[PDB]
Design a protein around this nucleic acid. Structure first.
Length: 343
RNA sequence: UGUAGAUA
């Protein structure tokens, strides 16, 4: 029940209350929205002895506060301003409960804060991460857990993350189309060794055609194009070749086509552009179609920018007579600019 | 002129 002290504070009877005055009341106040903000505020100016006073009390109820809508911020504040002995002690209260905390709306914030606050080489940390072993996919798919998984990947030594990689075996296609899975996969590509990512990249190439057209998978494919090895980039480009026109008019895949134009080799880029500028499959010209498309106009712009003089000139000549046309379409109103300030 | 996740 709400003690007099808290009632009084909430009624503004203590307009300049000091942290020291909360001895015995820290845990109660931490679970109150206003008491919690008060403690957060005072911790930023508190002396070390004053922080320790607050620490002693919060430590005793650490798990409870970690899963509290208002107390979890007080816990986080010590990961922010506490000394390492204090952080390690709090981490110890996370240990043994990593899974339920990871899936919990407030608990998951505390875990991420610990991961950012405590040196990865500290046993505690290692122990915490290992508790996710056997639950990786459940966390990846959880609205709270997925951020914990990402933060582990961002913060911990990649060798220790082999179980996460193994967990993804045969699941890379499905999870790259997942709102959180795609983010986790991108973190993996960023942080794990080329050794670890090899099987991940393999499964990505297996399903490139599908992933480039997916609302989330298109981002994973773009990541590889922007950050991956040349040989992986060339694999993605080869999947795009022969499909430029179609993919360029696609809300998601248009973006991948752009990154292909930017990040391919001079020679690969030329072949892609050639598919737009210099081929004749049927009556309607590809360039003409792409020019005034809501999405493909962006691809045409990237091609004009990245093209060697010869191809650039052909594109310009082919657009030239269609000025009046590009006029009516919202989407040609950047292509026309480049046309004018090229002629 | 065009797409990405859980707290007071």
């Amino acid at each position: 029940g709400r003690s007099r002290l808290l009632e009084d504070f909430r009624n503004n009877r203590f307009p300049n209350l000091q942290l020291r005055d909360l001895i015995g009341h820290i845990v109660e106040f931490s679970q109150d929205q206003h008491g919690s903000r008060f403690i957060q505020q005072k911790l930023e100016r508190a002396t070390p002895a004053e922080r320790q006073m607050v620490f002693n009390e919060i430590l005793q109820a650490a798990y409870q506060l970690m899963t509290d809508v208002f107390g979890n911020y007080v816990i986080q504040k010590f990961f922010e301003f506490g000394s390492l002995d204090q952080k390690l002690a709090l981490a110890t209260r996370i240990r043994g409960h990593v899974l339920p905390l990871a899936l919990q709306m407030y608990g998951c914030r505390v875990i991420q804060k610990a991961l950012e606050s405590i040196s990865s080489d500290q046993q505690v940390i290692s122990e915490m991460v290992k508790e996710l072993d056997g639950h990786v996919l459940k966390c990846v798919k959880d609205q709270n857990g997925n951020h914990v998984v990402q933060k582990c990947i961002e913060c911990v030594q990649p060798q220790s993350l082999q179980f996460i990689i193994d967990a993804f075996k045969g699941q890379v296609f499905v999870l790259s189309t997942h709102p959180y899975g795609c983010r986790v996969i991108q973190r993996i590509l960023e942080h794990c060794t080329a050794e670890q990512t090899l099987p991940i990249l393999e499964e990505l190439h297996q399903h490139t055609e599908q992933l480039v057209q997916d609302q989330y998978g298109n981002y994973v494919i773009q990541h590889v194009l922007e950050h991956g090895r040349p040989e992986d980039k060339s694999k993605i480009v080869s999947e795009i070749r022969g499909k430029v026109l179609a993919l360029s008019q696609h809300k998601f895949a248009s973006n991948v086509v752009e990154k292909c134009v930017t990040h391919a080799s001079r020679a690969e880029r030329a072949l892609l552009i050639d598919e737009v500028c210099c081929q004749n499959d049927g009556p309607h010209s590809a360039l003409y179609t792409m020019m005034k498309d809501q999405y493909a106009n962006y691809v045409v712009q990237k091609m004009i920018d990245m093209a060697e003089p010869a191809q650039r000139k052909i594109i310009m000549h082919k657009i030239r007579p269609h000025i009046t046309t590009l006029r009516k379409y919202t989407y040609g109103k950047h292509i026309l600019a480049k046309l004018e300030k090229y002629y």
